[PDB]
Amino acid sequence: MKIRSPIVSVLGHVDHGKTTLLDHIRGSAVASRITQHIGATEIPMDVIEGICGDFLKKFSIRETLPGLFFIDTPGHEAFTTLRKRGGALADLAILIVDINEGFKPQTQEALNILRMYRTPFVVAANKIDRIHGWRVHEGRPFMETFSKQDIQVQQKLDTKVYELVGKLHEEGFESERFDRVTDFASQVSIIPISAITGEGIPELLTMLMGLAQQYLREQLKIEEDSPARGTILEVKEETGLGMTIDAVIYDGILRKDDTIAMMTSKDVISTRIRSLLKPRPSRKKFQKVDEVVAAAGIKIVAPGIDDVMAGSPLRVVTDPEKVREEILSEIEDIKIDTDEAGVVVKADTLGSLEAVVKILRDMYVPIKVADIGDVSRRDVVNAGIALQEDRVYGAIIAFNVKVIPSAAQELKNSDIKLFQGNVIYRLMEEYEEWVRGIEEEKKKKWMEAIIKPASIRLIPKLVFRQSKPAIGGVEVLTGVIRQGYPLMNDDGETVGTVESMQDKGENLKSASRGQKVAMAIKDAVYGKTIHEGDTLYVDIPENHYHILLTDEELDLMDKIAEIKRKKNP
Numbered sequence: 001m002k003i004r005s006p007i008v009s010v011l012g013h014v015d016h017g018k019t020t021l022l023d024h025i026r027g028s029a030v031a032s033r034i035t036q037h038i039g040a041t042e043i044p045m046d047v048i049e050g051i052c053g054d055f056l057k058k059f060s061i062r063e064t065l066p067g068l069f070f071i072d073t074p075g076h077e078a079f080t081t082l083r084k085r086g087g088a089l090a091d092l093a094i095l096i097v098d099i100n101e102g103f104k105p106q107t108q109e110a111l112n113i114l115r116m117y118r119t120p121f122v123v124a125a126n127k128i129d130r131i132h133g134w135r136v137h138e139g140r141p142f143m144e145t146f147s148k149q150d151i152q153v154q155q156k157l158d159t160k161v162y163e164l165v166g167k168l169h170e171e172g173f174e175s176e177r178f179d180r181v182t183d184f185a186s187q188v189s190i191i192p193i194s195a196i197t198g199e200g201i202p203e204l205l206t207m208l209m210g211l212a213q214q215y216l217r218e219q220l221k222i223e224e225d226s227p228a229r230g231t232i233l234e235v236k237e238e239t240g241l242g243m244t245i246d247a248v249i250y251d252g253i254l255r256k257d258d259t260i261a262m263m264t265s266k267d268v269i270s271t272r273i274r275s276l277l278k279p280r281p282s283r284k285k286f287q288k289v290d291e292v293v294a295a296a297g298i299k300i301v302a303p304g305i306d307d308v309m310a311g312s313p314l315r316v317v318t319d320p321e322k323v324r325e326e327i328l329s330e331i332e333d334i335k336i337d338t339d340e341a342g343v344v345v346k347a348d349t350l351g352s353l354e355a356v357v358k359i360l361r362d363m364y365v366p367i368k369v370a371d372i373g374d375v376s377r378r379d380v381v382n383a384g385i386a387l388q389e390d391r392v393y394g395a396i397i398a399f400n401v402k403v404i405p406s407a408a409q410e411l412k413n414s415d416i417k418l419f420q421g422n423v424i425y426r427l428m429e430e431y432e433e434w435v436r437g438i439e440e441e442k443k444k445k446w447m448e449a450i451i452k453p454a455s456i457r458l459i460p461k462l463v464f465r466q467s468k469p470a471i472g473g474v475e476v477l478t479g480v481i482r483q484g485y486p487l488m489n490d491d492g493e494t495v496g497t498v499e500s501m502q503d504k505g506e507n508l509k510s511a512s513r514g515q516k517v518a519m520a521i522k523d524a525v526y527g528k529t530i531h532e533g534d535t536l537y538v539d540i541p542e543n544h545y546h547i548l549l550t551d552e553e554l555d556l557m558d559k560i561a562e563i564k565r566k567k568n569p
């Protein structure tokens with residue numbers, strides 16, 4: 001066994017500097033001493049100790065680590081691909097943000113993923129070299145270059161930093177510029193840097209070493225001789241070679257003659273490796289190696305790929321049915337396929353699928369279907385089944401996936417809501433803003449079937465018909481009397497029901513306050529059951545009442561209570 005280098009991912013919005021940061025870090029190592037990796041950068045502990053002064057001596061872990069292994073976000077902002085069985089592929093993360101631009105959509109996406117997988121991270125506030133008036137001092141520690149800036153320039157920098165603190169606070173994260181931090185364990189450290197210059201990179205590495213000191217122990221243990229375990233980051237064509245696999249190995253050893261298993265869009269497969277390629281420091285872009293040991297980024301050339309899925313687990317095979325079962329189990333634990341509750345989810349990768357499923361669970365939103373691939377006719381059908389019993393579940397959440405024609409058409413039918421997008425948190429805000437509305441609409445239709453409070457007075461001298469339909473001039477004292485509303489006496493005695501109302505020449509379904517109309521009252525009779533001048537009240541049902549307006553309606557609301565309480569509780 002051995003202790004490997006922590007894996008640090010670099011996340012952030014398009015062009016805030018993810019790649020440039022790693023390229024600079026690689027440059028520092030090269031021009032100071034380095035093994036090259038595909039899509040990653042390995043910086044040795046002596047190089048780190050060289051860049052970070054004695055600021056590292058307070059971290060005993062420094063003595064036991066081979067160094068740090070950085071991995072760039074693969075593809076276009078594909079943060080969710082950086083995963084592995086037990087959680088995130090990275091042990092630590094750097095959330096980079098243009099100090100000048102601040103948080104952008106992908107910054108929020110990265111933050112939510114980091115929060116969700118509980119991965120410790122620091123925030124690198126990049127591009128400080130572009131703050132108006134900044135004077136560059138090449139590769140110097142942030143404290144050193146900052147102290148040489150004009151006071152107002154320093155002030156402008158701290159202002160941008162406090163806007164980051166404000167945003168992070170709104171996100172549930174307390175934070176401060178790394179040197180002002182109080183409890184390293186609970187506050188995010190923000191390190192101002194310049195990926196182009198090397199400014200602040202010294203403190204950046206020091207803080208990452210701090211996080212290793214604080215959180216990493218058992219997770220760094222690997223068995224250098226075990227069959228390699230890794231994750232596929234990209235599957236893509238390379239001139240002269242065919243389809244190729246870019247992968248990170250986090251445990252074990254991968255050899256040139258190994259057989260490896262992975263998932264395809266259809267099933268689990270295995271292939272025999274032709275070669276392992278790493279970037280070359282003969283005008284050949286790659287250099288062949290015989291093997292690489294855990295803590296490596298490698299490009300693999302093998303024949304059975306083309307349909308291999310980004311995000312797929314990668315495993316060297318020593319026992320084929322034992323490995324196929326392991327990979328299948330890994331898939332199943334994320335897939336979800338019951339009948340209970342509702343909500344249909346589709347994503348492009350196992351990692352993006354896992355992320356959405358995780359976020360939805362934290363939102364307490366039940367899921368009936370969670371699977372990979374374009375929205376199918378089958379998906380719509382299951383959503384339909386869910387549509388029943390809470391139209392709330394009658395939805396399909398599709399992350400970075402397309403909709404199969406047969407599905408779109410068969411979907412044209414309303415009642416099934418579809419959310420599509422390549423930004424997870426945007427999909428969730430959209431689903432929730434949808435649920436709010438649906439709920440209001442249901443609650444609205446909830447009132448339409450409930451009798452409200454209302455009061456009316458029988459204008460004396462305006463009796464058009466005594467018996468059978470009683471008809472007389474009425475003035476709505478308070479509330480909104482309606483056609484069909486029950487009416488009772490000052491003693492809770494039922495007098496009759498409002499049969500019809502007429503405002504001058506217009507027939508009304510409802511009458512407001514001081515309206516005054518000719519009203520027909522079924523089952524009532526003047527000079528017996530009802531009397532000229534009398535005030536009548538609406539006889540609201542017991543329960544319909546429990547579901548409790550203006551000051552007038554409130555008073556009456558209690559006025560009705562008294563009346564009913566007379567011959568009751």
Ligand SMILES: Nc1nc2c(ncn2[C@@H]2O[C@H](COP(=O)(O)OP(=O)(O)NP(=O)(O)O)[C@@H](O)[C@H]2O)c(=O)[nH]1
Pocket residue numbers: 012013014015016017018019020021076077126127128129130193194195196197
């Ligand atoms: N002035 C300045 N430019 C920087 C800095 N860091 C990166 N850049 C510039 O910003 C642009 C984007 O950098 P890049 O590293 O590709 O960003 P990204 O976040 O990796 N990109 P994408 O999401 O497409 O991968 C480049 O032109 C780069 O030179 C910095 O500290 N200062």
Ligand SMILES: [Mg+2]
Pocket residue numbers: 018019020
């Ligand atoms: Mg880039």
